[PDB]
Scaffold this active site. Structure first.
Site, PDB file in Angstrom:
ATOM      1  N   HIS A  81      44.927  40.379  41.812  1.00 43.57           N
ATOM      2  CA  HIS A  81      45.950  41.435  42.298  1.00 43.57           C
ATOM      3  C   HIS A  81      46.105  41.151  43.869  1.00 43.57           C
ATOM      4  CE1 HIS A  81      43.964  43.935  38.951  1.00 43.57           C
ATOM      5  NE2 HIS A  81      45.052  43.558  38.475  1.00 43.57           N
TER       6      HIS A  81
ATOM      7  N   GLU B  70      44.103  42.556  46.480  1.00 45.34           N
ATOM      8  CA  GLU B  70      42.731  42.554  46.404  1.00 45.34           C
ATOM      9  C   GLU B  70      42.386  41.063  46.948  1.00 45.34           C
ATOM     10  OE1 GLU B  70      41.997  42.668  42.349  1.00 45.34           O
ATOM     11  OE2 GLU B  70      42.083  44.842  41.756  1.00 45.34           O
TER      12      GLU B  70
ATOM     13  N   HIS C  90      37.342  41.321  42.320  1.00 43.15           N
ATOM     14  CA  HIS C  90      38.509  42.128  42.485  1.00 43.15           C
ATOM     15  C   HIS C  90      38.256  43.051  43.571  1.00 43.15           C
ATOM     16  CE1 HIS C  90      41.603  41.887  39.094  1.00 43.15           C
ATOM     17  NE2 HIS C  90      40.481  41.207  38.498  1.00 43.15           N
TER      18      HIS C  90
ATOM     19  N   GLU D 225      34.256  43.607  41.407  1.00 41.06           N
ATOM     20  CA  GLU D 225      35.019  44.436  42.238  1.00 41.06           C
ATOM     21  C   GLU D 225      34.036  44.422  43.595  1.00 41.06           C
ATOM     22  OE1 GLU D 225      37.444  45.386  38.834  1.00 41.06           O
ATOM     23  OE2 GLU D 225      35.481  44.658  39.389  1.00 41.06           O
TER      24      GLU D 225
END
Lengths: 410, 345, 88, 347, 481, 171, 126
Positions: free
Chosen positions: B61, B64, B163, B256
């Site tokens: 993304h 990100e 992420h 993440e």
């Protein structure tokens, strides 16, 4: 085929034309779901949803710049209508069979049936007619800029003392004047609206109890669920993940299952705009005394003098009116689903059908300086346009558009 | 540090990382705007035998962006360590593929300091790169198709998605058959190995050692041991880790790193300190399970309904938690904490 | 009155409004919504309340405390209910 | 009744955002704006049903203060006065604040400063929060020779002469040996915020009295806080169902010579018996609040142009006479200070 | 009338009657003495570059200027205007100047009323003075009615050869005009009627210029592919109109990392040449700020860049400025960054003049932006709309000149230090264009952020400083081409 | 469309970015001088041989400014120089609009310039030119823009400013 | 009889098109003053147009199409205030699209057509 909308001053004429296209059976049937009634071979015309007359653009143009609105009259063109209100009124029960929101959709007339008194509908004199709405209060299509407990001057003390101390820091009696730093203790003129406390369910399903408490923990009245019950705020500040178990209107997304619809397949309506006056549905009304002092948390609170409360918001997909039952007495005859409680609602009408309604608007005169909150469509690109047909041709309503976007002072 | 790498700065950073150490820089394709998808191989070119492939894909993304920077810094640090023990052994026994950005278009469209809590998350066509993969439950996403072809062209055994928006290690099966958003725990055939990998990555992180992320939006998502299942966390239709587990034999875990998707560059060094160990650990966690040789031959383990295929040279790297397993070939073995047990066929 | 307050709707047409029908699967947490119809008419949305009076919530339920209920034995006036300086 | 009023410059001619958050308690958090405007309040009885009122504002003198300190006449200085006849401003009257007209005509009173509150989330403001600029209203300007006047006709309201929300009994003859003033006080809940139900609904109150269910007035020279019982003025209103709603007759709270006259019924969808809980007449269109402000007279601006707004003004204050005419030894000076010995009810 | 009687009232509100909105705004002003009642020859020469050289005169007169939209519209009024109307245009204004009071200051600093002092106020109804209004200068009426503002000093420029003057240079003595003199009790007032000006486009097109065709019916005309233009080959279809004129601008990224590492703000900026004096084409012709999904980019000098509250005059960071975006005109206007099109020799045309069949949108007006500009009295002009946006008026509202009358304490140069202050009330009536759109879905409306914030947008902060957080545009409703 | 309004979008998924479109296909001007309120998209004048219209798009996606129109929601001088130099597609004369090269067919009246050194010069004072001949479309609608220069249709013609019950729907 | 002629202007402008502003008051409109922090790095600085940076100020109009015979100190000399000089370029435009590496390239406009906001004078009579 008219299907238009004309805005003339404080009036809006919303007309809609739709193309439209059974069995007397003694029907009957847990103890709370038993029923008895009759399935008539008649179909009835229903247009008791706001989207049947308002386009999404019309709804925006209505809720973005009007503090209130109420219907005035309707013309119906096409069979009989109960002008004297003899047959049971099945309209206003938020049933399907209404005119489709999309003018191009062809709908079928819902079958008429009632519950119990046997009513033979051929015992009536059986096209166009006109109906005039009775003077109903304007729907409060606004939010309150001020909360009920913050109506005071944040600079001047009160001349009324409140008992602030009962023990020396031995027991004593000390009094203090209500001021900006002790706003909770200031003397006040009005109380929040009545409360019928409901269970709190989180949209984050992990936070909820590991039990099937949808019915056992419900807020039923004596046993039918008080759905949605009295108008109360859905949640308090920064608690949008919570909602009363059966205290909000929940609409269906397109192709949503009749039962076992997932949270992604339904649209929850948030009544938070009325949190300035209405107590949060999932929280208590307050604390009273009981007798060391003892405090009792009051959950169901009836009407008290000085109470002020907002009605439940209406929605583009929500009901417009409901017949006030012909009872000896009532308190605040307003539908719990929202809308206009009419002692003589539009008669139920038992090809093409055109319905036009004249709504009187309440133009807002607000001296608020900053910009208001308006309903807008997301500017960011999307696969399909909101409130528009998809590739397959299925018109869908993506979100339940509220009605209270402009602000007002309490 | 204290600077993000933009168009032709990502390529320059990868070239200087290659010069710092060995390294082959190439492109698996081009994005919508023709921005190349830069991949750095640490060990284009032939596939050396005996080298378990590890690919680290970040910046799926565009907003990100901690992933992009930590990938660049990891490549530079690996090159410097090989040029200067642990990193030398890691680069000598493991083929490591570094892909700093799969969505350069979104990264360019991303803004300074948004943190997540329009934004560049999707590619130039508006299609999510994490929602554009086949799921067991194209031509508009050239990056996704390019990565699919790249995976099909290789035999990656371990992989890591980096992420933003959270601080957690999610293991495969990010979707569920019933497709409920949260709650439903989708368990894989190799769930124990995925859990071990996520735990190994999260233990070294100075934040994921505690499951609670301490960031806006949740404030109570106390993940157990700092790891979670994707479906148990939040359902994602057509994710890439599930595709890599199903359509490929790779063991792909989403990571993440921070809850602020696009932190100011001053934080990057700190973020590097939060990941420098962890990333390396993840890579050095590919030497677990069993390794051996047999030529497009099916390798299976009894008690698990997931069969891998040997590489072009018969090499198979079956990642496993320590224990005794029954290996089977179609065309009692002990596993201990440390190097993979060598079994030949 | 020839018909009851909770039985003034159509017994042939189900509602377009959804109600929370189930929270636990058939067992983990979930959120199931159903449309009130001829069969499940107790759960249908109503417009009015009667003039024990009913059942209310007594606490905030969570994954550790079961939601207990309170029987209302005295209910004052509420909006939608149908049956000196001031009087009622 | 005619009183002499003095009005100073408030906020130094500025609109100041004010707010209190927990970083205090959540029950006392507020957000709002303090305006440079003062307001005329005559909501107390010492300042049946009202029929109408006439309001005059005359004999205005605007005076400069120069710093020794000297006060001089400013003939050309104006004051802006306007009534919110349309109730477009937050109606801060009816909250029983100080700053009303003195009960003694010979006393000169300072104009209370007008500020208002709005929606808040802690100390922060929400999107629905509204900002009202009081200069955005048509306001009449007055010099020393100008006078202001407006008449307001009261709406019809019943003449001033049951459900219970149980209170906690407290004895004037000092009761439990604990601080139950707030913990055991009869409160209500609104938006996750507990507000004290003071004085609550009208109920009966000889040593017994509800913990927060009566109006307590202040004796002359009484402490702002922690006032002794000798320094205050108690008003007397002479399955266990502890809270009962409407089912039933009752009487309203008695009005007092020191108490409020009227309150504004909130503009709301519904209300049950909209009689103010502190007593008085509930009015949907109450007497509009009169807002008055000293017009800013800047000091000498620079010789060269500067874009920034002027922050230097001459110190000014306006005194005058305000007359309100509403158509519907005890209580004497001691040192010459007017005192009200006992609260007088109309029953 | 008199010393102790108010000469006017504070009228400041808005009134909406159908298609008309009358916005009146009153402010408190303080006019000092400028240049000590002297006309000063000011100039800049090369001995400063040749592009910045000027010659002109600074006058002791101040000038009233209410040529910003926030002078009359509250942010809520602007929201009402742009969320509901397809267009608006001023109709007539009434200007009043009242409660005038002249105060003299004496230094030993004591300020005392000077009842007998006058101020001279006049309007150039015949436009005989140089028109400095419409140049987007400071000194406008503040957006916040509670702000007391300084009256900007009036000066003007004339023809120059470097720092020197030429024979055609004109000296305008503002005393030569008949000016009304006002004591404390006097008031000034006039009414101006706006000339016929087209409605400003308060809408963004729902259709791009190249997407006006039926996507289901093939064209009956052929193009050299031969093929008929159809849905799939939609770019080759014969079309009736061309995009607006183009004047290519250098592209700059708000994400500073993507920009070139050079100080190209001036050398690479788009400029025009006039009398050997290169000037910046700021903001240039109305063109789209950026194409789709390029919101980070903007023309180097092709947009209006407003300043946030308490922003530095020079070298202000990107965080202290608000960039306006003309992305609403992507439908017709070409993008200001890339070329207009391709011709054959092929070559990309960067600057394209007017061509038959070209349609374009004017630059958007903003709440902080100028309202009107004076069209220069020239023989020829093309689409006389101001390049900063607004209304091009041949006879704009006359500029009001106000000056403290000197009071003496060869020519006399010893004057008592005086300054006047009073109230200025300007009331403009705007004719609205009611929208009649059969569009089904809701469109974009300007709304305030719902989520909680430290301070309210378009409201004062804790210190009492009114701030505008974002530049509110005007094109939110939609109209198909 | 079987009495249906169908969304129609064509992105770059074969087609390039210049051919992308978004719009709706609804179930609902050929040869001196010659929806009444013009609230619908005016597809006429585009020289076509079923009513469907287009709106704003970003590829196959639709921006929030896209308008959906439901049609059931409804009840010049006598016809007788600037240069845009002409020359199949790569070398053809095109114009750039929102990152989409559209063929300049037939362009201004003088590869793609007919109905079937200075290369481009805009308007100058004293310049005189003749409009394209008619054969062909009679007219076209001048787009409602603030400005237009010689609003004559480049294709030729006259430029006119105003030229058991079930909830599911039956199918 | 003659038709409605546009009333030929037998005068000369006393103000140039680029000097129509007040030389004493700054502009509230910012302009991109610099992009490189004066090792130098990249930034975005904005400045307000004022009496000193007059050439960088925002202006409502443009000179006529690319006409004055000559500039200062070199006949249609009376229209150099509005019309550009006949013997030089109309103006300066962007030629390329910059990047990290592509330094911005610049284009000299020699023939400019009509643009919105463009004003011009006509040739004098004799």
């Amino acid at each position: 085929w008219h299907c238009d909308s004309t805005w003339l001053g404080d009036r809006v004429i919303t007309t809609s034309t739709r193309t439209w296209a059974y069995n007397y059976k003694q029907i009957s049937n847990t103890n709370d779901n038993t029923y008895f009634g009759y399935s008539t071979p008649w179909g009835y015309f229903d247009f008791n949803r706001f989207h049947c007359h308002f386009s999404p653009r019309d709804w925006q143009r209505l809720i973005n710049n009007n503090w209130g609105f109420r219907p005035k009259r309707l013309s119906f063109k096409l069979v009989f209508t109960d002008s004297e209100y003899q047959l049971p009124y099945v309209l206003g029960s938020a049933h399907q069979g209404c005119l489709p929101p999309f003018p191009a959709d062809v709908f079928m007339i819902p079958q008429y049936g009632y519950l119990t008194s046997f009513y033979c509908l051929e015992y009536f004199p059986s096209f166009q007619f006109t109906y005039t709405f009775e003077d109903v209060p304007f729907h409060s299509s606004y939010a309150h800029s001020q909360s009920l407990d913050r109506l005071m001057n944040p600079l001047i003390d009160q001349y009324l003392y409140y008992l602030s101390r009962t023990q020396t820091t031995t027991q004593t009696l000390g009094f203090s004047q209500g001021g900006p730093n002790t706003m909770a203790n200031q003397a006040k003129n009005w109380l929040p609206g009545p409360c019928y406390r409901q269970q709190r369910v989180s949209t984050t399903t992990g936070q909820n109890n590991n039990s099937n408490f949808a019915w056992t923990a419900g807020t039923k009245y004596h046993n039918s669920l008080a759905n949605p019950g009295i108008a109360m705020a859905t949640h308090k500040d920064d608690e949008e993940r919570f909602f009363p178990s059966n205290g909000i209107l929940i609409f269906g997304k397109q192709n949503a299952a009749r039962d076992n619809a997932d949270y992604s397949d339904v649209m929850l309506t948030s009544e938070e705009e009325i949190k300035t006056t209405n107590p949060v549905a999932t929280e208590e009304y307050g604390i009273v005394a009981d007798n060391a002092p003892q405090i009792g948390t009051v959950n169901s609170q009836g009407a008290l003098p000085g109470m002020v409360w907002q009605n439940r918001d209406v929605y583009l997909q929500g009901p417009i009116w409901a017949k006030i039952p012909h009872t000896d007495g009532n308190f605040h005859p307003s539908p719990l689903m929202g809308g206009f409680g009419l002692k003589h609602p539009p008669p139920q009408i038992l090809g093409q059908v055109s319905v036009e309604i004249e709504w009187e608007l309440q133009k807002e005169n607000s001296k608020r300086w900053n910009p208001e909150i308006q309903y807008t469509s997301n500017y960011y690109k999307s696969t399909s346009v909101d409130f528009a047909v998809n590739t397959e041709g299925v018109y869908s309503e993506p979100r339940p558009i509220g009605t209270r976007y402009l602000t007002r002072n309490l | 540090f204290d600077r993000y790498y933009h168009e032709e700065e990502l390529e320059s950073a990868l070239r200087e990382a290659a010069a710092a150490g060995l390294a082959r820089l190439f492109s698996i394709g081009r994005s919508v705007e023709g921005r190349p998808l830069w991949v750095l191989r640490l060990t284009a070119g032939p596939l050396l035998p005996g080298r378990p492939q590890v690919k680290l894909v970040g910046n799926m993304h565009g907003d990100e962006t901690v992933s992009r920077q930590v990938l660049i810094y990891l490549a530079r640090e690996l090159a410097a360590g090989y040029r200067r023990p642990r990193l030398v052994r890691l680069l000598n026994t493991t083929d490591v593929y570094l892909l700093p950005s799969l969505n350069p278009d979104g990264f360019e469209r991303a803004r300074e300091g948004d943190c997540g809590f329009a934004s560049g998350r999707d590619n130039s066509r508006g299609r999510d790169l994490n929602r554009s993969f086949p799921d067991q439950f194209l031509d508009e996403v050239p990056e996704v198709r390019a990565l699919i072809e790249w995976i099909r062209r290789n035999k990656f055994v371990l992989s890591g998605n980096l992420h933003g928006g959270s601080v957690v290690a999610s293991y495969p099966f990010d979707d569920s058959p019933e497709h409920k958003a949260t709650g439903i725990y989708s368990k894989t055939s190799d769930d124990e190995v995925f859990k071990y990998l996520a735990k190994a990555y999260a233990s070294n992180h100075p934040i994921m050692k505690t499951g609670e992320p301490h960031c806006p939006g949740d404030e109570d998502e106390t993940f157990k041991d700092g790891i979670t299942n994707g479906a148990h966390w939040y359902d994602v239709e057509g994710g890439m880790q599930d595709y890599n587990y199903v359509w490929a034999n790779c063991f792909e875990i989403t990571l993440e790193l921070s809850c602020c998707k696009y932190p100011p560059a001053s934080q990057l060094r700190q973020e590097w300190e939060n990941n420098r160990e962890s990333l390396i650990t993840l890579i050095e966690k590919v030497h677990i399970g069993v390794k051996g040789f047999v030529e497009n031959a099916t390798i299976s383990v009894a008690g698990i309904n997931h069969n891998i295929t040997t590489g072009r040279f018969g090499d198979f790297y079956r990642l496993l938690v320590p224990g005794t397993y029954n290996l089977t070939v179609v065309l009692n073995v002990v596993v201990k904490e440390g190097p993979a047990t060598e079994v030949d066929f």
